Design a protein around this ligand. Structure first.
Ligand SMILES: [Ca+2]
Ligand SMILES: [Cl-]
Ligand code: NA
Ligand SMILES: [Zn+2]
Length: 387
């Protein structure tokens, strides 16, 4: 790289994901292929990993990301917490990069719903929250600096297989059961059983604000049955809602691109069209869970009420490919095909890759995908960005 900025890289997972000490060290970023953070660091690209609530709303996850980056106690905002009935304060972090408070900046590389979270964190840093500012005045409580506005420390957001317009998977019948089957499948990829009541946490869902935690003598099977019936699955303040086509559009209506930030999007597809009616079908090698449980629905579900037609049928096993190049539904962001120069304040569509939702992070194998070269080439591009 010809280095133009010194900003560290920050990895951010989707609606599954866990810290480097979790899952007995099986890495979400790298999976069965290795340790992407370690590869980037070993190649001279300083990289860190964020771990936030996988099932929690993008709002909560953005507040957690902020505290984890600059240090301190997660503050979800007094108004937000009162409106949805969960704790105002989350856990306390030492802070990965306190220098963000004095002028440092970062590149965020986000997978799946991580891309919504990274977008939202930028929006909150730039504009704050009018509602939280007003509520703090009215009720004489403190206000997180995150909601003040006029802050800036994200130089770029890169999203990979992100459902910026949602995924129609949420509309599948029995989505609740199949989604937590997906969680168990990822646990099994990590060689972690779902019917064993581990005494260590192994996979912390970080639901402190909701007061939820896997109990002593409780298996993931039993825990997920509880989670299904909990507010983190049944409220609007959830990843599940933000993942829907409707919820993603609502998010897009206020989370917009900042002129001070480069946005890069990577799309993923792992399907073919058949010759019967033009439906899409999983290619050989797509991870087994998606191939059997999710891809047939994704490549055949049409919904005229929500504008879900033939453009939505291509998919990566989890997300409709059309959803990934940037926010569109309810969004005024601009999306431009990458042309050799990356532009600020717009989505640079870096193209589509023939890699499925879990292969792109190495949680499922794909020997024809040079995952190491993919992330090293991305880090070079970010290293080259003009500050
Ligand atoms: Ca595969
Ligand atoms: Cl509990
Ligand atoms: Na995901
Ligand atoms: Zn919340």
């Amino acid at each position: 790289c010809l280095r133009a900025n010194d900003a560290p890289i920050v990895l951010l997972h989707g609606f599954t994901g866990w810290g480097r000490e979790e899952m007995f060290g099986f890495k979400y970023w790298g999976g069965v292929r290795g340790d992407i953070e370690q590869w980037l660091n070993d190649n001279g690209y300083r990289t860190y990993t964020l771990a936030v609530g996988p099932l929690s709303s993008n709002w909560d996850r953005a507040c957690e990301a902020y505290a984890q980056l600059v240090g301190g106690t997660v503050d979800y905002g007094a108004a937000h917490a009162a409106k949805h009935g969960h704790a105002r304060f989350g856990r306390t972090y030492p802070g990965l990069l306190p220098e963000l408070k004095r002028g440092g900046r970062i590149h965020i590389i986000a997978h799946s719903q991580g891309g919504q979270t990274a977008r939202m964190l930028v929006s909150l840093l730039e504009n704050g929250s009018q509602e939280e500012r007003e509520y703090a005045k009215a009720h004489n409580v403190s206000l997180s600096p995150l909601f003040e506005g006029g802050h800036h420390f994200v130089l770029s957001v890169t999203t990979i297989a992100t459902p910026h317009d949602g995924t129609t998977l949420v509309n599948m019948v029995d989505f609740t059961d199949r989604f937590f089957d997906l969680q168990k499948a990822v646990l099994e990829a990590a060689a972690v059983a779902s019917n064993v009541p581990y005494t260590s946490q192994v996979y912390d869902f970080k639901l402190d604000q909701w007061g939820l935690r896997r109990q002593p003598g409780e298996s993931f099977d039993h825990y997920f049955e509880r989670l299904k019936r909990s507010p983190v699955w049944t409220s609007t303040d959830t990843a599940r809602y933000d993942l829907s086509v409707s919820g993603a559009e609502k998010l897009n209506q206020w989370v917009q691109a900042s002129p001070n930030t480069y946005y890069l999007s990577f799309s993923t597809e792992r399907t073919y069209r058949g010759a019967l009616t033009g439906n899409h079908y999983p290619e050989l090698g797509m991870n087994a869970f998606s191939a059997v449980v999710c891809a047939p629905f994704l490549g055949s579900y049409r919904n005229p009420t929500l504008g879900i037609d033939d453009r939505w049928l291509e998919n990566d096993g989890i997300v409709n490919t059309v959803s990934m190049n940037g926010p569109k539904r309810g969004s005024s962001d601009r999306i431009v095909p990458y042309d050799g120069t990356l532009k600020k304040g717009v989505w640079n569509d870096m193209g589509t890759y023939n890699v499925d939702h879990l292969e792109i992070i190495g949680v499922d194998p794909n020997p024809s995908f040079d995952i190491r070269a993919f992330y090293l080439r991305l880090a070079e591009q970010l290293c080259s960005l003009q500050p």
